Design a protein around this ligand. Structure first.
Ligand SMILES: [Cu+]
Ligand SMILES: [Cu+]
Ligand SMILES: [Cu+]
Ligand SMILES: [Cu+]
Ligand SMILES: [Cu+]
Lengths: 85, 92
């Protein structure tokens, strides 16, 4: 019960850590890439927690979709960073 | 290395603002006991952060690929926000 809230909270504080290190970036394109990647990783964590503790099928469906999509956009921003600035 | 660079640009400030806003709303959303409801409220606040970060990118960003992604992200996140919003207004 409260175990779900902590797992949610753990993924959040995890995302906050990396997102903090990405906004001190000066180049706003690099800041968007690094920040949204950490932000997207937060979605995946929050979605995986829902798959563990969630009971509602519609939301568990959305969580599965969110994991698939965010992972995709993440690999794009990663490739964008390996080539740019 | 430069001392006057010890202050953030406007773009970094807007990015910082969107984070502090997203964290606040997400904090108030994990207070849910029901994890399905917690996922909905939390991902909504989390998704709104994506929109803010993408809007900040559209305001200050120059790279075409990333500007396109920011545009798409705003569309998709808003849609999924509407889904979770209706899900919250309909499920108990
Ligand atoms: Cu994201
Ligand atoms: Cu200041
Ligand atoms: Cu917090
Ligand atoms: Cu999100
Ligand atoms: Cu490029």
């Amino acid at each position: 019960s409260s175990a779900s809230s902590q797992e949610y909270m753990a993924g959040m504080k995890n995302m906050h850590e990396k997102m903090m290190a990405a906004v001190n970036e000066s180049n706003p394109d690099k800041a968007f890439a690094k920040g949204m990647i950490a932000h997207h990783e937060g979605a995946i964590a929050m979605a995986e927690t829902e798959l563990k503790y969630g009971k509602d099928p519609e939301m568990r469906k959305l969580a599965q979709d969110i994991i698939k999509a965010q992972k995709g956009e993440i690999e794009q921003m990663n490739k964008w960073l390996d080539s740019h600035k």
